[PDB]
Amino acid sequence: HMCDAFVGTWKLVSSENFDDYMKEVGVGFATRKVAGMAKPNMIISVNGDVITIKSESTFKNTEISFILGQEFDEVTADDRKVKSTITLDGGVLVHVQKWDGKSTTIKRKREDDKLVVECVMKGVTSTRVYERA
Ligand SMILES: O=c1cc(CSCc2ccc(Cl)cc2)[nH]c(=S)[nH]1
């Protein structure tokens, strides 16, 4: 029942500062423009200890499956090949991605009826708000 309140199908409804986050990560111009337009659905499910997070959009469909605390290699939507570890910290899913000596952290939390995604790269934060689909 760890992640019960995350399970379901969620649709992006707002984004702030995502272009600056993508710049800080190193995403190139064309990918930033097309990725910034996307209105993904995020589909979260749990089966035993395995959590699956799917993102589906007109830009790029992604899927990760993982066990909390157990590192996994991930190909991001912008085509980085990263090493990821996701943990639960005080009810927040904390997702750290490492690549090329760099690191970014994505936090996913339930706030009221929303799922709030905070993406941080150094000093730059983007907030993406999802509602139930
Ligand atoms: O599941 C998720 C994860 C995130 C983390 S940044 C992903 C991402 C990265 C690069 C590009 Cl070009 C587009 C997208 N943001 C939302 S909204 N949902």
Q: Where are the domains of the chain?
A: 4-129
Q: Which residues pair with 97 in a beta bridge?
A: 84, 104
Query: Which method was used?
Result: X-ray
The 8 Å CB, 24+ separation contacts for 113-121 are 115/6, 115/10, 115/42, 117/42, 119/18, 119/21, 120/21, 121/21, 121/24, 121/25
| Resolution value (Å, 1 decimal) | 1.1
How much distance in Å is there from the Cα of 49 to the middle of ligand 1? 23
CATH class of 4-129: mainly beta
- With contact defined as beta carbons under 8 Å apart, do 17 and 124 qualify? yes
Report residue 14 as tokens: 């707002």
Considering only CA atoms, which residue is closest to atom 6 of ligand 1?
119
Q: If you measure from the C-alpha of residue 2 to the centroid of ligand 1, how many angstroms do you get, rounded to a whole number?
A: 23
- One-letter amino acid at 88 equals L
Is 130 annotated among the ligand-binding residues? yes
In whole angstroms, what is the distance from residue 19 CA to residue 54 CA?
21
Q: What are the two backbone dihedrals, phi and then psi, of residue 118, each rounded to the nearest 5 degrees?
A: -115, 120
Decide: 98 and 82 in contact? Cβ < 8 Å. yes
Residue 35 CA, ligand 1 centroid: distance in Å:
9
Torsion angle, alpha carbons of 82, 105, 62, 76, to 10 = -30
C-alpha 2/C-alpha 49 separation (Å) is 9
Token duo for residue 29: 């111009």
Regarding the beta carbon of 108 and ligand 1, being less than 6 Å apart is answered no
- CB neighbourhood size of 42 (10 A): 22
**Beta carbons of 13 and 131 less than 8 angstroms apart:** yes
Is the shortest distance between the CB of 86 and ligand 1 below 6 Å?
no
6: DSSP letter: G
Q: 42 in ligand 1 pocket by Cβ < 6 Å?
A: yes
DSSP per-residue codes, 43-96: EEEEETTEEEEEEE-SS--EEEEE-TT--EEEE-TT--EEEEEEEEETTEEEEE
What does the alpha-carbon distance between residue 133 and residue 15 come to, in Å, rounded to a whole number? 16
Instruction: Check: CB of residue 82 under 8 Å from CB of residue 95.
Output: no
What separation in angstroms does the CA of 67 have from each of 41, 81, 84, 92, 105?
Answer: 22, 19, 11, 15, 17
For the Cβ of 95 lying below 6 angstroms from any atom of ligand 1, the answer is no
- Euclidean distance between CA atoms 20 and 95, whole angstroms: 19
The best mutation among 78, 108, 124 to test binding of ligand 1, ranked by most ligand atoms within 8 Å of the C-beta, falls on 78
- Strand, coil or helix: 126: strand
